[PDB]
Amino acid sequence: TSWRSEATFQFTVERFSRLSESVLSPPCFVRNLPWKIMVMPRFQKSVGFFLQCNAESDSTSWSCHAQAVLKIINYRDDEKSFSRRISHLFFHKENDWGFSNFMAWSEVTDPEKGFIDDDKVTFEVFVQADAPHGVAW
């Protein structure tokens, strides 16, 4: 159910080589909160990859600590997929966490590396979150 303490979800960004603004995935519910993958170009230059939690809510009383593995899938060889880990207390003022320079833009878009196909790149997040505070009192 949406109350699950962990989940793995993916989001495929299309027309990747042309990305010029931040893109957000639909929500994946964990601990009954909406988690989303956020991808943004940073300085072409590098791919920004962040995990976002409960950003839409106007609440300023919530908090949720979680650990996660952010990974860019290599479709040719999963062992070649690139991942980084995070641990963060998410709350209204710090509702997303990740890396502005997750991977070099030239590497992810290299047609011979295995991360891009038909100008599509798939991002994956495995999030393990603790019970949130200040939400479902």
Binding site: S22, M38, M40, G48, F50, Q52, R84, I86, H88, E94, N95, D96, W97, G98, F99, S100
Partner: peptide, 4 residues
């Protein structure tokens, strides 16, 4: 890691 940091905020966007």
């Amino acid at each position: 890691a940091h905020s966007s």
